[PDB]
Amino acid sequence: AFELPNLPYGFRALEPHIDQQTMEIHHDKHHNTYVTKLNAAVEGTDLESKSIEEIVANLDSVPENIQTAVRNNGGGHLNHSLFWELLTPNSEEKGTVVDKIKEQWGSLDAFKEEFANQAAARFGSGWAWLVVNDGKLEIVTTPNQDNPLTEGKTPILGLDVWEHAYYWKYQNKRPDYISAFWNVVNWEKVDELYNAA
Amino acid sequence: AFELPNLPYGFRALEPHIDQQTMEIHHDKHHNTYVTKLNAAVEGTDLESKSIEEIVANLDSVPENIQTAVRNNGGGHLNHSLFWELLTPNSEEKGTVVDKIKEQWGSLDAFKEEFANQAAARFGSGWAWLVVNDGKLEIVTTPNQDNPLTEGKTPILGLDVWEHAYYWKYQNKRPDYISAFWNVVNWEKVDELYNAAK
Numbered sequence: 001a002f003e004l005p006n007l008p009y010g011f012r013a014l015e016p017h018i019d020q021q022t023m024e025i026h027h028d029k030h031h032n033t034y035v036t037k038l039n040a041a042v043e044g045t046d047l048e049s050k051s052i053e054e055i056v057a058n059l060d061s062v063p064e065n066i067q068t069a070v071r072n073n074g075g076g077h078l079n080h081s082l083f084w085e086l087l088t089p090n091s092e093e094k095g096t097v098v099d100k101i102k103e104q105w106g107s108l109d110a111f112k113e114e115f116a117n118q119a120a121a122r123f124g125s126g127w128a129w130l131v132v133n134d135g136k137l138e139i140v141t142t143p144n145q146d147n148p149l150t151e152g153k154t155p156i157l158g159l160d161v162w163e164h165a166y167y168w169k170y171q172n173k174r175p176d177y178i179s180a181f182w183n184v185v186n187w188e189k190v191d192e193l194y195n196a197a
Numbered sequence: 198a199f200e201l202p203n204l205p206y207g208f209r210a211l212e213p214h215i216d217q218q219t220m221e222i223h224h225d226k227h228h229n230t231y232v233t234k235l236n237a238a239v240e241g242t243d244l245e246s247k248s249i250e251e252i253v254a255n256l257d258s259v260p261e262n263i264q265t266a267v268r269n270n271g272g273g274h275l276n277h278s279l280f281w282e283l284l285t286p287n288s289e290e291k292g293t294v295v296d297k298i299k300e301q302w303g304s305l306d307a308f309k310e311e312f313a314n315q316a317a318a319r320f321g322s323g324w325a326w327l328v329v330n331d332g333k334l335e336i337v338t339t340p341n342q343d344n345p346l347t348e349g350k351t352p353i354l355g356l357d358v359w360e361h362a363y364y365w366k367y368q369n370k371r372p373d374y375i376s377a378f379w380n381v382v383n384w385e386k387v388d389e390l391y392n393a394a395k
């Protein structure tokens with residue numbers, strides 16, 4: 001059954017951009033809760049055999065009695081699993097995806113600008129994503145723990161913009177959190193998820 | 198000319214149920230942002246001077262150039278305006294609505310169990326409500342800053358279950374925040390909202 005994956009770095013590795021208090025509570029309480037509630041919904045069903053990607057890609061096929069719980073807690077597991085890996089203490093703005101971004105948006109900054117506007121515009125709880133749609137790049141956001149895989153789009157970069165992702169250090173200033181984020185993006189992992197799609 | 202309302206008590210009045218840090222930033226920054234953005238959104242229109250209740254009950258009528266901004270910021274202004282007046286340091290579990298609740302749910306704490314279960318279950322950002330629906334009591338939750346007035350139900354009690362409302366004191370444990378809330382409910386304001394409804 002699903003386990004809370006360890007972070008690939010220590011709680012403090014992403015300072016000063018993401019504070020150790022938030023990394024610890026966000027990983028060990030919030031993500032752990034999604035794993036517990038996901039397990040309680042799937043265990044004793046034929047969902048036990050499927051990857052989270054498989055489940056989230058096909059939420060409409062899930063039996064209605066557990067669909068909401070699998071949508072919310074399944075989305076939660078997948079989103080944070082992606083997120084912990086898309087962060088690094090050794091961010092470098094180079095690679096296959098950084099190059100695709102400059103051809104399409106005209107520069108990395110212009111892309112960041114549009115990502116930031118959508119990320120900030122996401123009202124309430126949700127995620128800002130870079131996706132592949134029909135082999136093209138697209139900036140989308142989703143509400144709560146919805147994931148663009150449910151709409152057949154492949155996520156290659158994600159930002160958590162639930163208040164719990166930035167309240168400790170940035171309180172009500174989501175745009176400053178979005179700015180700090182660029183400093184910790186694992187562009188190696190963005191390339192790997194793109195090269196998969 | 199929409200305005201951030203004053204708190205009718207101090208930032209410490211709701212301790213230890215809601216912390217002074219939260220009361221201060223929730224009102225002074227979060228609510229203030231809704232009021233500022235609402236005033237900006239409605240500039241030049243008949244919305245400038247309408248009651249926020251009328252506006253939110255008639256979101257369908259709002260021109261599409263500003264509908265989302267007024268849904269989000271107008272609802273944030275109404276919701277928080279109601280919320281500050283529905284909290285008090287002198288909560289007493291009595292009156293017209295407590296009596297109707299005991300008739301309908303059997304007791305007040307049985308009602309709290311149902312309210313607490315729906316308020317816990319509202320996934321992501323939102324509100325838990327007690328509403329008047331065609332003269333009857335109903336518990337409902339809404340997403341984000343959506344308000345039951347839009348669906349023709351009058352809110353008489355509300356609880357903010359956005360993470361900002363409880364994160365400083367309770368972190369992930371929204372149920373512990375929901376239990377503390379009962380200690381600071383202004384049942385006199387609930388009765389007044391009920392009577393304005395009926």
Ligand SMILES: [Mn+2]
Nearest residue numbers: 030160162165
């Ligand atoms: Mn999160």
Ligand SMILES: [Mn+2]
Nearest residue numbers: 227357359362
């Ligand atoms: Mn609030």
